[PDB]
């Protein structure tokens, strides 16, 4: 039912639903099977940063993930999002664990959306420290805000261990007006920083930044490879 | 019950409840009787702009209202808002008509709030739409198709009705202070058109901050500006 555009940081290759055979960053347009992907070296226990950029003029959704040693992966995809998303949306962060696991810790998250006309309406928010009672965020599933200033999208246990089978998402409280047919420029950018750590045989499954219909919720059974985004793998 | 801080653009002197005896701008802290006021020359039928500014270091709430010919009023009041507002709030615009009446038309509205230890929230409407999904409209407030916000009832011929009250609040709660931030600041800006053919215009427009669940108090038309249950 939900309408999803996402950028996925995919730590685990599910080569049976069309992942490449390596960790990857992807652009997802109404499907977990990314329209475009690139090879990502996930750096275990290090803090990475993702940037996501779109505007309605070039109509190219782009993303880049990097670490402080300077290694980065990038991915771009040509798409007119006007023809994909409702005019009003909510923006959010998603994460999963499945059979393998990992911390999915958000340390910071910022977002800007603008409509400029013919003829500016704007929304911008920036979290660099989350609080225990984040009244601006809609937490779904296992997602907690802690007292340590962080957003934990998936269940971690009191000794700091990540759990399997977990799914969590945080959405900004106010609906966003992503497009407006008489805006000449409708643009958005998002940025988050994240710590993925695992002592496991392999890390799974990743974190996503997403945009959806306003009333979006975690689809039934979207742990593991579905990243809390999609009711299935089609 | 509600906690209110407001800057009021007060077009009508109610000298019994402490207004000065001229149209005025005021700083209202938990009371319709302003802690501070300044004389304001409302220009009928002209587009005015109001700027409001606060930071937790100077601890001075300030406001200026101007018109394009460049006449302006200003008011400042020294107050630690940490001691007066909940940590979480909603921000919004309010207006009234009573026995006299006016258009209370908002043409644009922007807001910035920052906690630097930065968390930040900023919005800016230069055009409002029919279905404004990030705004909570209360009482008589509508967003029209002309890009404007009408805080008070206007009739199909474009006439302001009396005995009207309306507010718009931004949809997201705002985290206005955080005891461990060194600077918490905010401002706000809005542009407005007050028009009346009436014997006197009444009653004005306010920018306000309140508890997150604030609603129009019972009977807060006319001189209470949709902000206060009474005139204490
Ligand atoms: Ca995968
Ligand atoms: Ca008055
Ligand atoms: Mn993938
Ligand atoms: Mn007054």
Q: Could you state, in order of their start, the residue ranges of all structural domains in chain A?
A: 1-234
- Within an 8 Å CB–CB cutoff, is residue A125 touching chain B? yes
Q: Which residues are bridge partners to B93 per DSSP?
A: B168, B207
Residues B178, B185: Cα–Cα separation, whole Å: 11
Query: Which residue in B has a C-alpha nearest to residue A88's C-alpha?
Result: B133
First CA to last CA across chain B, in angstroms?
A: 13
- Is the domain covering B1-232 a CATH 2.60.120.200 domain? yes
Please give the structure tokens belonging to residue B88: 């979480």
* DSSP of A52-85: EEEETTTTEEEEEEE-TTS-EEEEEEE--GGGTS
Asked if residue B200 belongs to a known ligand binding site, the reply is no
Q: Is A121 close to B125, i.e. CB distance below 8 A?
A: yes
Structural contact between residues B149 and B98, judged by C-beta atoms closer than 8 angstroms = no
Cα Rg of chain A (Å, integer): 17
**CA A129 vs CA A133, A210, B106, B116: distances in Å:** 12, 20, 34, 10
**Bridge partner list, B54:** B186
The CA–CA distances, whole Å, from B142 to A88, A92, B138, B153, B166 equal 19, 29, 9, 8, 8
**Residue A24, annotated ligand binder?**
yes
Ligand nearest the Cα of residue B202 is 2
* Cβ–Cβ < 8 Å for B35, B226: no
Asked whether the bond before A205 is cis by omega within 30 degrees of 0, the reply is yes
User: Cα–chain-centroid distance for residue B45?
Assistant: 19
* Euclidean distance between CA atoms B54 and B45, whole angstroms: 29
User: Which of chain A's residues have a Cβ under 8 Å away from the Cβ of B117?
Assistant: 129
* Cβ atoms of residues A212 and A219 within 8 Å: no
**How far, CA to CA in Å, does A64 sit from each of A51, A111, A112, A143?**
5, 15, 17, 24
The answer to whether the annotation marks B122 as part of a ligand binding site is no
**Residue B146 Cα, ligand 4 centroid: separation in angstroms?**
30
Backbone torsions φ then ψ of B113, nearest 5 degrees: -130, 135
State how far the Cα of A114 lies from the Cα of A183, in Å rounded to an integer: 9
Using a CB-CB cut-off of 8 Å, the residues of chain B touching A125 are: 120-122, 172
Judge whether B55 and B184 are in contact, CB under 8 Å: yes
Q: Is A75 exposed, middle or buried (0-12, 13-18, 19+ CB in 10 A)?
A: buried
CB A56, CB A81: distance < 8 Å: yes
Q: What DSSP state is assigned to residue A203? A: B
- What lies within 8 Å, CB to CB, of B71 at 6+ separation is B41, B43
User: For chain B, what is the radius of gyration of the CA atoms?
Assistant: 16
Distance A24 CA to ligand 3 centre (A): 6
Q: For domain A1-234, give its CATH number from 2.40.50.140, 2.60.120.200, 3.90.1150.10, 3.90.1640.30.
A: 2.60.120.200
Specify the DSSP element, H or E, that contains A145. Answer: strand A144-145
The tokens describing B10, both together, are 């007060």
**Which residues are paired to A122 by β-bridges?**
A114, B124
Phi/psi of residue A155, each to 5°?
-55, 120
- Residue B63 · residue B6 · CB < 8 Å: no
Cβ distance A72 to A105 under 8 Å? Answer: no
∠ CA B163-B26-B147 to the nearest 5 degrees? Answer: 55
Structure resolution in Å?
A: 2.2
Enter the tokens of residue A115.
Answer: 């409509």
Which residues, at least 6 apart from B96, have a Cβ–Cβ distance to it below 8 Å? B104, B152, B164, B165, B202, B203, B204, B220, B221, B222, B223, B224, B225, B226
Rounded Cα distance, B96 and A146, in Å = 43
Contacts of residue B230, defined as CB under 8 A and 6 or more positions apart, other chains included, come to B32, B224
Interface of B with A in 87-116 (CB under 8 A): 88
DSSP per residue, chain B: ---EEEEEEE-S--GGGT--SS-EEEEEESSSS-SEEEE----TTSEEEEEEEEETTTTEEEEEEE-TT--EEEEEEE--GGGTS-SEEEEEEEEE-SSS----EEEEEEEEEEEE--EEEEEEESS--SS-TTEEEEET-EE-SSS-EESS-B-TTSPBPSS-EEEEEESS-EE---TT-SEEEEEEEEEEE----SSS---EEEEEEE-TT--PPTT--GGGTTT-SS--
User: Quick check: A210 and A191 in contact, CB under 8 A?
Assistant: no
Q: From the CA of B23, how many Å to the nearest CA of chain A? A: 32
Q: How far apart are CA A62 and CA A139, in angstroms?
A: 26
Q: Do B121 and A121 touch (CB under 8 A)?
A: no
Identify the CA nearest to A26 among candidates A71, A69, A77: A77
What lies within 8 Å, CB to CB, of A58 at 6+ separation is: none
Note whether B221 and B151 are within 8 A (CB): no
Touching A: B residues 148-187, CB under 8 Å: 170-175, 178
Task: Check CB contact under 8 Å for B119 and A135.
Answer: no
Q: Look at A177 and B133 and tell me if their CB atoms are within 8 Å.
A: yes
């Amino acid at each position: 039912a939900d309408t999803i555009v996402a950028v996925e940081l995919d730590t685990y290759p599910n080569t049976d639903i069309g992942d490449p055979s390596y960790p990857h960053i992807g652009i997802d347009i109404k499907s977990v099977r990314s329209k475009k992907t690139a090879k990502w070296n996930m750096q275990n226990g290090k803090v990475g940063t993702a940037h996501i950029i779109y505007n309605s003029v070039g109509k190219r959704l782009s993303a880049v993930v990097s670490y402080p040693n300077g290694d980065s992966a990038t991915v771009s995809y040509d798409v007119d999002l006007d023809n994909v998303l409702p005019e009003w949306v909510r923006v959010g962060l998603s994460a999963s664990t499945g059979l393998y696991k990992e911390t999915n810790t958000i340390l910071s998250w910022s977002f800007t959306s603008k409509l400029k006309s013919n003829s500016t309406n704007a929304l911008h928010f920036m979290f660099n420290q989350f609080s225990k009672d984040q009244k601006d965020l809609i937490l779904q599933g296992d997602a907690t805000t802690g007292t340590e200033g962080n957003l934990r999208l998936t269940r971690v246990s009191s000794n700091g261990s990540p759990q399997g089978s977990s799914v969590g998402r945080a959405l900004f409280y106010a609906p966003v007006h992503i497009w407006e047919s008489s805006a000449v420029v409708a643009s958005f950018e998002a940025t988050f920083t994240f710590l993925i750590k695992s002592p496991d045989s392999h890390p799974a499954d990743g974190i996503a930044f997403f945009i959806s219909n306003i009333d979006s919720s975690i689809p039934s059974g979207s742990t593991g490879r579905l990243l809390g985004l999609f009711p299935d793998a089609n």
